[PDB]
Design a protein around this nucleic acid. Structure first.
Ligand SMILES: [Mg+2]
Ligand SMILES: [Mg+2]
Ligand SMILES: [Mg+2]
Ligand SMILES: [Mg+2]
Ligand SMILES: [Mg+2]
Ligand SMILES: [Mg+2]
Ligand SMILES: [Mg+2]
Ligand SMILES: [Mg+2]
Ligand SMILES: [Mg+2]
Ligand SMILES: [Mg+2]
Ligand SMILES: [Mg+2]
Ligand SMILES: [Mg+2]
Ligand SMILES: [Mg+2]
Ligand SMILES: [Mg+2]
Lengths: 347, 170, 137, 39, 244, 16
RNA sequence: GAAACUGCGAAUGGCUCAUUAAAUCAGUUAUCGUUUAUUUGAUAGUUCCUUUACUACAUGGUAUAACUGUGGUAAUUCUAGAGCUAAUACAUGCUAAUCUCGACCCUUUGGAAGAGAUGUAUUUAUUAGAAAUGUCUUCGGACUCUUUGAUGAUUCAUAAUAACUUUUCGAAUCGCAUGGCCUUGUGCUGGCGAUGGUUCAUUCAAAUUUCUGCCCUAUCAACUUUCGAUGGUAGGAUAGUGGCCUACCAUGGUUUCAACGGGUAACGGGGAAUAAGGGUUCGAUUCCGGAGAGGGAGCCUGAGAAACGGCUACCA
């Protein structure tokens, strides 16, 4: 609790295998007190260099703790967040809960989760009740406030927007670190319906400039076979939205390159289900349609190579059997001419 | 009592100079600060001008930088293992610049698994001796800060030729 | 090179063992100026010397003098002899005078007793040394 | 004692700070335009 | 001594002030300010011994605290304020504007100027460097730090500064054929045009200057101040045009 | 540019 | 407006020449080797970030003088106990921003769905610091590319990444005056000054420092080095270089071109006297620089003192 001795005490008292460290028997009783104390320090506003370091110190002792205790700390952050009503009902937000105060509480929670993810990374313990379902609820209200709120409450609108940006970033992080390890089938429908579904309609015009957290999210699913069922929902709505970004006239190279890499993985990652066949047919035709206009935009040799790598992927899988696929694969190829061995092999 | 003036010393030719003047404040000296491992005790010093100096009477914690990966972590200082100037400082565990000390492996290790997901593979490859140190649980580090001046015990981890030479000396 | 208790290194010059781009250890050097050519033996040398004009943390500024080497019996420094004629007006005649200057020499130079060395002033290296050998002939 | 004069002084200080920030931004923009003109 | 001195004997004062040796025992000691001690004219000397408006120190104090004197477009109340070369002194009550420029003799001359000329001054670029936040700045001979300089402005160049706002209106490069003014040495106060900047590595640069009479002299670079291109000075010159 | 152009007279009384 | 707190000065000035023989000093260099109150010019919106359970329409005694009152001592610019009360003293602590791109409309004085970015101070580590001779066009112009600076010289300036701190700063200060907006509220906004505050530069300064130059003495020829003398490495110390000191190393350094030692009724110089010229003597003494405050030694304060019309010990 003492401010001057706080930093030295953490390194001494809480270091794993420390001589002064808590004995294994005494952890169960002492630990809740430790978590509450460290939780108290975590709300210190970072308005100075010392204060920023203190917020880094409190998050940095998390790896020392055992995983059950880490989950306890994440729980304490989310206890204030009232979310059980949201998931209890059919995912409808209460008007009373929608206030600047509640937005302020969630912004703190996501920041702690973002900080914890950076420290633990793959070792981060992911649980439905403690972190994921409060996290999804936060992105839900950010959507709820922004559409419902009037332009007059600029401060609330700005505050909600920050929660959306952090929440989407917080998702894209947790998918990356622990996506493969954790099994998401139970919460899978909830994540799409609450996060991806509302923004699918305008996903195309939104992400032209550079990759965004929601876009980085879609790419990860495209890369990982297990999470393709995300791409299957709503007649492959997310799959189309990615190509709608590509189909736009003004999409920049930073956004182009990743998606073709993602699309190439899907072609090179066979999956045993009907939805996969309709997807790849959708993926190939859309990426094949707009390809020549993308090449002129491309200004990097590597960006050219990945474009070729997708073409050779098409030929190997046998889509070139189709007359429309073949004739247009040539059209994109001649645009490349208008790596060399890869081209010659394709010809 | 401590003074630095070149006057009291003999001349290059061996002649001895006479006392030109009394001792001056602007050529003063102060007692050494033998920093040792122990509960953080630092006291400020009013120096020339409005500036101020920190005297590290005791420190446990220091900021050590893993250069090869470009990170820096705060870590407890275990003890002084070797110092190149005077070995009594090693015997007394006195902390000064260029002293060779032992630090805990914990924050560096946890960062290692977190970033590399390994207890990609090519990047995770690390020099064998340091991996042996990780397995040991303590790392050899060299203090680059001056605890007698700044009140810090910052340092950097030993690697490569530096590490090999200091192990050979050990 | 490693003939002493402490490690000799060019300060703040880091070699990353991971990248291992080149076998030769990275070496920092500078040109002293005044048209003084940095010798190659300094460029691809292996000596460590903090007082070296080309590889150490020392800068040449002030007077530039020339002298004849009279002693080289110590480590990394020499003693040179500068001779001159002082005028006596009463007798309207010159008088031979001399002075001995101790000057630091970097190991990049090989100096014997008798050659002519051009030296440049630098910060006080030691009690009596204020110059650094910059050219041998 | 909280009086109108103290409120005046606090408000004036805040106004001075914002005015200084705006002036610095304008100066930086002008320098950038000069550099763009030459390049 | 043990600390800064605060007294100046009359015999030790700069000669160019023209202080009577028998008038007293002490001379005005210039306080810290834009210009160095030896190259500065304290306001007391200017108001009393040159303009003769005040008869002793005390009326000078009265004039100053009446706020009738403006140096560098700003009111000054220190009697020993070190006004120096190319400093504009305004007395609005008298409707008088002065620019401090040495005569051919080497002495600060009472040179009256118009308001339009008084609106701007000239400063030699003593330093050009990047400050904090990566903001370039120039330090002039009078200690003015001007940020966001024109990147062509280099050391030894001269910049035209607007007194009211303190920005660089224009600048002159230091090149052969430019018109220069000598601010030190035996040639002090002479005006001419450059012929060569002779350069010595690790040593003081030397500049050869030719006057309108075709006479040539050499002076150290530190004593040279560009004031314009030949036949077109950017400031009004004193009587004699720096000849002899 | 040209310099600014240059710009009380004695009075006498006799008495007694 | 007494007294007292607070801030500044007292480190300038004046006096004397005891000590001092490469020391001071004169001339001439360097700080890429460091501190610097003050003067002068620049210089700091970080929106947000859970207990908002919230002072910023402004926080405490974690506090006292002057003062009231009770007292000691032969005596001093001696002061004890108790009761009070302030800050530009002391200790704490906050309050819907700006900038990049920008789809889509619109074709400009354009609007902006949204993707993004966000102080200083200290310490360490790392990184940067180097055949477009075409096309169209309205005949103008547009289309693609550039992108740090200085020094003779740098690990320079500056910027960036990761952490760090018994760790700072980012106005809880004051005078004069009552203008402007309105939804008429002691609502919102607002002038001219003073004093403070981070960093840089300038100025006044300070410290070391490169080279040449001092009277008599050889019946002073070898000196220095055990207890640093010369140099190397590492550390401590300092504002900082440096045997300045410490630990380990080598054996070095000066000298008949007079080292070393001794004498000096030796502070050095600008100068003064004499002389036809060469020379000889004097120079405490109106200006500069150095040292001292009866003699040694050691210190608080402060930007600046080894201060003595500041302090402590020892000797007379
Ligand atoms: Mg120079
Ligand atoms: Mg003697
Ligand atoms: Mg000397
Ligand atoms: Mg003052
Ligand atoms: Mg100031
Ligand atoms: Mg009391
Ligand atoms: Mg050293
Ligand atoms: Mg020793
Ligand atoms: Mg005497
Ligand atoms: Mg004298
Ligand atoms: Mg004294
Ligand atoms: Mg006496
Ligand atoms: Mg004394
Ligand atoms: Mg005195």
């Amino acid at each position: 609790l003492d401010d001057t001795l706080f930093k030295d005490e953490i390194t001494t008292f809480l270091t794993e295998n420390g001589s002064q460290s808590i004995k294994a028997e005494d952890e169960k009783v002492v630990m809740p007190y430790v978590l509450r104390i460290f939780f108290g320090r975590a709300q210190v506003p970072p308005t100075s260099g010392q204060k920023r370091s203190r917020k880094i110190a409190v998050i940095s002792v998390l790896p020392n703790f055992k995983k059950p205790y880490i989950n306890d700390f994440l729980s304490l952050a989310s206890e204030r967040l009232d979310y059980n009503y949201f998931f209890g009902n059919s995912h409808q937000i209460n008007s009373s809960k929608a206030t600047l105060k509640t937005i302020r509480r969630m912004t703190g929670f996501v920041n702690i989760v973002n900080s914890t993810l950076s420290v633990l990374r793959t070792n981060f313990p992911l649980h439905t009740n403690s972190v994921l379902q409060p996290l999804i609820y936060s992105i839900a209200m950010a959507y709820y406030v922004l559409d419902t709120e009037s332009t007059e409450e600029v401060h609330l609108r700005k505050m909600a927007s920050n929660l959306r940006q952090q929440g989407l970033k917080c998702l894209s992080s947790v998918f990356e670190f622990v996506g493969n390890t954790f099994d998401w089938s139970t919460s899978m429908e909830d994540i799409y319906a609450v996060v991806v579904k509302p923004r699918i309609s305008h996903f195309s015009d939104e992400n032209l400039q550079q990759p965004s957290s929601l876009l980085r999210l879609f790419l990860y699913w495209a890369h990982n076979p297990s999470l393709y069922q995300f791409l299957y929902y709503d007649e492959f709505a997310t799959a189309t939205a990615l190509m709608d970004t590509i189909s736009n006239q003004h999409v920049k190279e930073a956004v182009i390159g990743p998606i073709i890499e993602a699309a190439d993985s899907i072609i090179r990652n066979p999956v045993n289900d009907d939805h996969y066949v309709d997807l790849v047919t959708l993926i190939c035709t859309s990426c094949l349609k707009i390809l020549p206009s993308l090449y002129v935009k491309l200004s990097d040799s590597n960006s050219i190579s990945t474009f070729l790598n997708l073409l050779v992927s098409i030929t190997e899988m046998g889509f070139i059997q189709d007359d429309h696929v073949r004739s247009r694969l040539i059209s994109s190829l001649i645009s490349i001419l208008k790596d060399t061995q890869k081209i010659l092999k394709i010809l | 009592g401590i003074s630095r003036d070149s006057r009291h010393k003999r001349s290059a030719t061996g002649a001895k100079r006479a006392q030109f003047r009394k001792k001056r404040k602007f050529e003063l000296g102060r007692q050494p600060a033998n920093t040792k491992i122990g509960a953080k005790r630092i006291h400020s010093v009013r120096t020339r001008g409005g500036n101020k100096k920190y005297r590290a009477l005791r420190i446990e914690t220091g900021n050590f930088s893993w250069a090869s990966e470009g990170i820096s972590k705060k870590t407890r200082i275990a003890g002084v293992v070797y110092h190149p100037s005077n070995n009594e400082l090693v015997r007394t565990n006195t902390l000064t610049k260029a002293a060779i000390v032992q630090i805990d492996a914990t924050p560096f290790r946890q960062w290692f698994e977190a970033h590399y997901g390994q207890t990609r593979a090519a990047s995770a490859k690390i020099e064998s001796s340091v991996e042996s140190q990780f397995s040991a649980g303590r790392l050899y580090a060299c203090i680059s800060s001056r605890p007698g001046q700044s009140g810090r015990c910052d340092g950097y981890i030993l690697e490569g030729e530096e590490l090999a030479f200091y192990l050979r000396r050990l | 090179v490693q003939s002493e208790r402490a490690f000799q290194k060019q300060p703040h010059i880091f070699n990353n063992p991971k990248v291992k781009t080149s076998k030769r250890t990275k070496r920092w050097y500078k040109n002293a100026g005044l048209g003084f050519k940095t010798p190659k033996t300094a460029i691809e040398g292996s000596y460590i010397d903090k007082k070296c004009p080309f590889t150490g943390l020392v800068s040449i500024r002030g007077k530039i003098l020339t002298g004849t080497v009279v002693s080289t019996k110590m480590h990394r420094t020499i003693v040179i002899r500068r001779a001159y004629l002082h005028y006596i007006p009463k007798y309207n005649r010159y008088e031979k005078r001399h002075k001995n200057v101790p000057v630091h020499v970097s190991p990049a130079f090989r100096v014997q007793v008798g050659d002519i060395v051009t030296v440049g002033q630098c910060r006080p290296i030691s009690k009596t040394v204020r110059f650094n050998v910059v050219k041998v002939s | 004692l909280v009086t109108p004069q103290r409120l005046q002084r606090k408000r004036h200080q805040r106004a001075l700070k914002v005015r200084n920030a705006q002036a610095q931004r304008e100066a930086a923009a002008e320098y950038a335009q000069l550099l763009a003109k030459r390049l | 001594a043990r600390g800064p001195k605060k007294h100046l004997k009359r015999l030790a004062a700069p000669h160019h002030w023209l202080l009577d040796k028998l008038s007293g025992c002490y001379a005005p000691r210039p306080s810290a300010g834009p210009h160095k001690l030896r190259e500065s004219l304290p306001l007391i000397v200017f108001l009393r011994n040159r303009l003769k408006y005040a008869l002793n120190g005390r009326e000078v104090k009265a004039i100053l605290m009446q706020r009738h004197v403006k140096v560098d477009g700003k009111v000054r109340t220190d009697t020993t304020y070190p006004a120096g070369f190319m400093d504009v002194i305004t007395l609005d009550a008298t409707n008088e504007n002065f620019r401090l420029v040495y005569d051919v003799k080497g002495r600060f001359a009472v040179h009256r100027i118009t308001d339009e000329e008084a609106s701007y001054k000239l400063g030699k670029v003593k330093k050009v460097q990047l400050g904090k936040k990566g903001v370039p700045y120039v330090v002039t001979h009078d200690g003015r730090t001007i940020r966001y300089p024109d990147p062509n402005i280099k050391v030894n160049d001269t910049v035209k500064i607007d007194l009211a706002s303190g920005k660089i209106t224009d600048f002159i490069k230091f090149d052969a054929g430019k018109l220069v003014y000598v601010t030190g040495g035996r040639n002090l106060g002479r005006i001419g045009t450059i012929v060569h900047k002779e350069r010595h590595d690790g040593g003081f640069d030397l500049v050869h200057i030719k006057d309108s009479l075709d006479n040539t002299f050499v002076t150290r670079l530190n004593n040279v101040f560009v004031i314009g291109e030949q036949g077109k000075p950017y400031i009004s010159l004193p009587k004699g045009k720096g000849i002899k | 540019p040209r310099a600014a152009k240059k710009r009380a007279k004695g009075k006498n009384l006799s008495f007694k």
